[PDB]
Amino acid sequence: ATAPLDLVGPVSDYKIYVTENIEELVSHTQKFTDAVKKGDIATAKKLYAPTRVYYESVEPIAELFSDLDASIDSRVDDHEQGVAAEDFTGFHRLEYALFSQNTTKDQGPIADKLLSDVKDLEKRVADLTFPPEKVVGGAAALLEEVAATKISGEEDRYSHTDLYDFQGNIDGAKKIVDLFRPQIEQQDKAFSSKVDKNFATVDKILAKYKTKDGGFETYDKVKENDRKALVGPVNTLAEDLSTLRGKLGLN
Amino acid sequence: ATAPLDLVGPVSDYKIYVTENIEELVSHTQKFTDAVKKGDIATAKKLYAPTRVYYESVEPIAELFSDLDASIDSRVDDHEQGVAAEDFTGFHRLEYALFSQNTTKDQGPIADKLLSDVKDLEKRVADLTFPPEKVVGGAAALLEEVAATKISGEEDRYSHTDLYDFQGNIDGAKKIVDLFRPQIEQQDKAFSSKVDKNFATVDKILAKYKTKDGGFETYDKVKENDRKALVGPVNTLAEDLSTLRGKLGLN
């Protein structure tokens, strides 16, 4: 097995990456929740998806905090009581108010809780010794999440900003693969190029829906043939990435 | 003496009719909310629409208590926050849990409040001096509600039991027309025959969707031809019935 300290290079660089994304998450969530508290629906809607990109890019770490992640990011699908669940809070609760209902009424406390929760997450990440097995395992976890809910447009059922989250997951996974390139190369000379090709295929389909202002079209614009073309490469990436924990001597 | 055709007669009889329906509403609501608290989803679903018929038949009086009516019977449409509104309670809040979400989780307090609210309504109706203009105008008020939400199937957006509510509104309006028939036919017997024929047309179409028990098909079963055939009679009735207050000197 591989001693975690032998992976300090890529693990340290990943914590720097996660920390930078978390700093941006906090600053964007401050602005997003301030807009909600101020009743500025248009500004809140514009900030929603760009803010979430920073969370979706660091899911391998955020999901280590199971209850906090649920507070920040649970979907309607996660609640027996649906949209009416008292425990349905965070981004998707505000997504419903802003995009389906066009309101900020009584959303102030939900916005305040979301800001408090992301500031909590920032502190927990600062305190965290990053386990390389969770980092390395995180790329496969991200691609499994893409396969489960993002290809089908089931992450943002009211704003339909799923492509922002999709691209964030992919970017967060590619970052992990890139950082561990030397360690992968020591055991498997062909692996990085194999996954790079499938990442490039996914990135090219996603790029068909980027906008000049720096965003994405809504999910209803994604053609059925592009949706179908994503399934294969995403599944092959998930399978390939699922071998890395073992290959690198972490489990 | 009191004249034999004095309006104190039919208004008294309407309070009896409303009182009898509210007695049934309380007993059925007890059984409906008991099932919700028990977790018996199948029984609660079967009791939902027959319970509501008694409320829908007396809406001219129930809607005089604005906050109570909202607590018992508001729709998602009535809430800026939609399904997540804390003040979304009563029949349609439980309708969402039972029919959309297939759950009774945490619905106990909502069921307790619905039973308490209909018991409140029962006491308020007993204490109420019925305003004769609200009684006589109640037939038009009910037909306007049919035209606004029942004919288009927008009353029960999760259970789709709108035909029960449709028929209940129609029956409650026909009761008012029948009670004031002696006074109306003093003034305009041709007008009364015109109203009866449109009621008979509506009842004949609705009867096409009755089931073997005193039930109705769900709204999706209503053929588009039968929907368009309902539109004319309902709108003629809404206009004709809007003249009753003036015909009886209550404007």
Description:
Chains A, B: This is Iron uptake system component EfeM. The structure is a homodimer of 251-residue chains. By secondary structure, chain A is mainly alpha-helical. In chain A, 69% of the residues lie in helices and 0% in strands. The first copy, chain A, has one domain (1-251). The longest helix of chain A is centred in the first third of the chain and has 30 residues, at 8-37. Chain A starts with 7 loop residues before the first helix and ends with a helix. The interface between A and B is medium-sized, with 17 and 17 residues.
Topology:
The structure is a homodimer of 251-residue chains.
Chain A (H helix, E strand, L loop, with lengths): L7 H30 L3 H16 L2 H4 L3 H8 L16 H11 L7 H20 L4 H19 L11 H18 L1 H7 L3 H17 L16 H18 L2 H4 L4
Helix pairs in contact in A: 1-2, 1-6, 2-5, 2-8, 5-6, 7-8, 7-11, 8-10, 10-11
Pfam family, one (chains A, B): Peptidase_M75
Keywords (chains A, B): Ion transport, Iron, Iron transport, Metal-binding, Periplasm, Signal, Transport
GO molecular function (chains A, B): metal ion binding
